[PDB]
Amino acid sequence: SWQTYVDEHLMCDIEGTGQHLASAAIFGTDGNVWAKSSSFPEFKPDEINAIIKEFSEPGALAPTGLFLAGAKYMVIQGEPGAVIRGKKGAGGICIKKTGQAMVFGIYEEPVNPGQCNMVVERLGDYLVDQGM
């Protein structure tokens, strides 16, 4: 099931490190959560709609910010329709869209935006190769 993917392939130990993502999830592109980590933020429906709209119209959240469970992430450079990236002080967020899914990764210090992006894009790219 999808819970296995979050636990074993998102919340895994990051390479050459003891760290791991603060939380993670896998959503459908329709915005229904398929699986999430125990400490995944209590997101609101309109926050997910905004993320869905950002993959349809890139750069829409850039001036105003990306919100998750009330927490604002300063939007940073991302791949249009594919990856959304955000900064919240020390922490951040990486959202990777595939054919049928959206893979969320949320990190904290000392995890880099590149390492969250590695975990999230690696899994996203596997699900793309498997035809999803």
């Binding site: 296995t4 392939h9 459908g28 229904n32 699900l127 498997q130």
Partner: peptide, 10 residues
């Protein structure tokens, strides 16, 4: 519904 996940990667 969520579609079935593919086989776990190596």
């Amino acid at each position: 519904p969520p579609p079935p996940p593919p086989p776990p990667p190596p």
